[PDB]
């Protein structure tokens, strides 16, 4: 295909030809729209060393952007840093619970709130910390694990915007305190992977 | 031992002394309070022959009254049945604790959730419900709930009961929070051998 209508706009703005061509490729993919890239974001991109900019746009184009409700703010997140899971397991999980999945540069959030949730959030009394998570793991394996403890209100897997893997920990909020305590009691020191034991702590002792 | 302060109140109401005696004995056990039974239930009891009234009270005494919110309606249910056992409570306690769901027991039904805690908006409805048949008559929701929990999120579960026997009628309805879960339950659990030689019959409520 030919260049998009916004290609010469990028060039006029003073972007390096190579950087402008890469961003335009992103435009034609549909990952991003030119109408949602502010002059601030373009300036930041312009301030990048050329091969730096190419890598950032390269990482953006070659990343799983499914369930990313804000592609623009995501790219900006990638830029600040430089400055996925089994899709069919995920699909089946989201279908059967109806829960939202939202991915940002530093987090993959499952639910929070669940569909049709009434009243206040459970809070931190119903929340547990889950540390020492194997970096290769995602919520497709974490969610079924914690579902046995009770009803997940949310699950937030913290992500490394650079490495692409998780930061090795997550928070899980259940709909009540007893489920949280249940998770601590039964899943602390759980060998989720050969040689890899999780660390589960109640957020509010 | 001595009789409760509600014993003479029963006698004043015109209850046969023998019937009032047995009812007051039920009061003592804590399974029932005089405040719980309303006049409609007592009148129905008074119309009963003494031999009949005594056995209605006997069946009530022997009933699993755990999680029965409406004792009056339960007593009336036994009476209407006459003119014609339970879950592992440690399992139930754990389930109810981790989910926070209500459990309500009537003479003809054991109901889990419906609605769940903190449910806002539209009920899932019949489109998200499955029929579960050929349930072994000795099975209760302590075993049925963990089975259907793997399929999706249970909005409610209604195990139908035989007021005559106190065992189930061999079928239940399960409503999930969406239809994908319901369809999932049908696909994965139809003909599920829940006990050796006993396979469940799961049908979507709305084909």
Residue numbers in the entry:
A (entry chain B): 22 to 104, 122 to 243
B (entry chain A): 22 to 105, 121 to 243
Reported in the publication:
Importantly, we showed that Syncrip recognises an hEXO (GGCU/A) sequence in a set of miRNA targets and mediates their exosomal enrichment. We identify a cryptic RNA-binding unit that recognises RNA with high-sequence specificity and show that this non-canonical RNA-binding domain is responsible for hEXO recognition in Syncrip-mediated exosomal miRNA partitioning.
The Drosophila protein crystallised in space group P21 with two copies in the asymmetric unit. Finally, we observed that two high-confidence and five candidate RNA-bound peptides mapped to the amino (N)-terminal region of Syncrip, overlapping with the ‘acidic’ domain that has previously been described as a putative protein-interaction unit. Analysis of the Syncrip sequence with this algorithm revealed high-probability RNA-binding activities not only in the RRMs, but also in the ‘acidic’ N-terminal domain. This indicates that the N-terminal ‘acidic’ domain, although specific to Syncrip protein, contains patterns of short sequences often associated with RNA-binding sites in other proteins. We also show that the domain is functionally and physically coupled by a structural element to a second RNA-binding region comprising the RRM domains, and that the coordinated interaction of multiple Syncrip RNA-binding domains is the basis of efficient recognition of the full-length miRNA.
